[PDB]
Amino acid sequence: ASIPSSASVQLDSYNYDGSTFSGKIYVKNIAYSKKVTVVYADGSDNWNNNGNIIAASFSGPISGSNYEYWTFSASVKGIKEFYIKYEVSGKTYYDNNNSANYQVST
Numbered sequence: 001a002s003i004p005s006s007a008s009v010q011l012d013s014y015n016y017d018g019s020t021f022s023g024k025i026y027v028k029n030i031a032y033s034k035k036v037t038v039v040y041a042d043g044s045d046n047w048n049n050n051g052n053i054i055a056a057s058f059s060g061p062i063s064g065s066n067y068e069y070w071t072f073s074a075s076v077k078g079i080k081e082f083y084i085k086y087e088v089s090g091k092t093y094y095d096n097n098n099s100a101n102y103q104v105s106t
Contacts, residue, residue: 026068
């Protein structure tokens, strides 16, 4: 782990065990009332108009930085790829792996 210097939001890690999709996300502490969402395509690669959504929750500050960790977990029947959306103070940021998304292998 190293803390991003500059990205507003950045995936730290995820797992998909065949039934539960979970992970952790670096989030820059820009303001409060943050919304951090994981948006995924299902097993058929259907985005469902960006309606397959898991809301992450605040975990804690990261010492020696202006970042925080947010975590997520949900029961997910199938998933091919995902990205992260971060809304704060009317601004909208993404970690979509530079438009490739994060690919979930089978």
